[PDB]
Design a protein around this nucleic acid. Structure first.
Ligand SMILES: [Mg+2]
Ligand code: NA
Ligand SMILES: [Zn+2]
Length: 352
DNA sequence: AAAAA
């Protein structure tokens, strides 16, 4: 039996159902841009369960015993089995509002509100937006437009590793005892990503040294001419608050990655790379690692399972047991899964 | 408002 919860499934990168899931992901995206939360959720959960299958669906009979496949989802599966394409997903891909929203939000610093503003202004291309003389851009949008081509190109593993080396060398300079872990998609086995994520923690740092680290590292990169964009969000972390972005100190950067630093098989001798850095208190390292490893659907199901099946409250900071009225401690992800009564799911099995 | 796993 297949669980309705992603945290109770193993979801590896060998997706045998890409024909179905790419269509369901398009339909979910469209419901997200069109403010239909209920419908977005249904397509996401159905796409997620199909991703977990060890075989391709080739008939409607193969969908038997699979949870989260409503009548609307089963009609989409049926249409794809019929001729290999989804008429519903194809109509979304041809929709003018969907196309503009995907295009505009592909720019770093442009979200739903700005994409909507530009669409209602009659803009349809990035060329027309960038060259417009009346529009005013935020500093994040200016960096988004300045480094567009590099940011829209996938970050690959040799590039993520070259960034990891930079992060580690910068962090060790100020905190020699620091632990630096690459998170997100790359930790789950992905060959590519839109960015590179890191979780930094220090067993000995004081509250102040841990506040100062991201400032020290970004200033060190600014001096070297590597910081292309920087936004540091201060911590709002509360040591004793119940579990519910996360509240940890973090920064969203654009780094200058020199081609010479990249050990791969293969113009300007550098590439712009989006880098996220998260600093957390040492005792909460496992919760932040679990939260930042993802995938987003895996994290959503973990929290839902903890609430509805275990009467536990879980987030990126802590795990609280409402019955025992006690916070549960963990030095690893394995201990969090054990506290939750879940079989351990390896990072590369969390691609829900 | 946007950045996010
Ligand atoms: Mg990522
Ligand atoms: Na964007
Ligand atoms: Zn990121």
């Amino acid at each position: 039996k297949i669980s309705q919860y992603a945290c109770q499934r193993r979801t590896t990168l060998n997706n045998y159902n890409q024909l179905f899931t790419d269509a369901l992901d398009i339909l979910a995206e469209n419901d997200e841009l069109r403010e239909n939360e209920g419908s977005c959720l249904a397509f996401m959960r159905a796409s997620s369960v199909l991703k977990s299958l060890p075989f391709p669906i080739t008939s409607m009979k193969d969908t038997e015993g699979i949870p989260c496949l409503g009548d609307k989802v089963k009609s989409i599966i049926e249409g794809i089995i019929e001729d290999g394409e989804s008429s519903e997903a194809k109509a979304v891909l041809n929709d003018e509002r969907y196309k503009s929203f995907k295009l505009f939000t592909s720019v770093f610093g442009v979200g739903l509100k700005t994409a909507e503003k530009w669409f209602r202004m009659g803009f349809r291309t990035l060329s027309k937006i960038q060259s417009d003389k009346s529009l005013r851009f935020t500093q994040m949008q200016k960096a988004g437009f300045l480094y567009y081509e590099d940011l829209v190109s996938c970050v690959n593993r040799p590039e993520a590793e070259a960034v990891s080396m930079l992060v580690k060398e910068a962090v060790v300079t100020f905190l020699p005892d620091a632990l630096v872990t690459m998170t997100g998609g790359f930790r789950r086995g992905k060959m590519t990503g839109h960015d590179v994520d890191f979780l930094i923690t220090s067993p000995e740092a004081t509250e102040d040294e841990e506040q100062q680290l991201l400032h020290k590292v970004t200033d060190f990169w600014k001096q070297q001419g590597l910081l292309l964009y920087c936004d540091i969000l201060e911590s709002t972390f509360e040591k004793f608050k119940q579990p519910s972005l996360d509240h940890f100190q973090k920064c969203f950067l654009i780094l200058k990655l020199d081609h010479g630093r990249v050990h791969s098989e293969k113009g300007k001798g550098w590439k712009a790379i989006r880098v996220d850095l998260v600093m957390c208190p040492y005792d909460r390292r496992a919760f932040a690692l679990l939260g930042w490893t993802g995938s987003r659907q895996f994290e959503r199901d973990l929290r839902r399972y903890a609430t509805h099946e275990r009467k536990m409250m879980l987030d990126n900071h802590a795990l609280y047991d409402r019955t025992k009225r006690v916070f549960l401690e963990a030095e690893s992800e394995e201990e969090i899964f054990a506290h939750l009564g879940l079989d351990y799911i390896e990072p590369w099995e969390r691609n829900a």
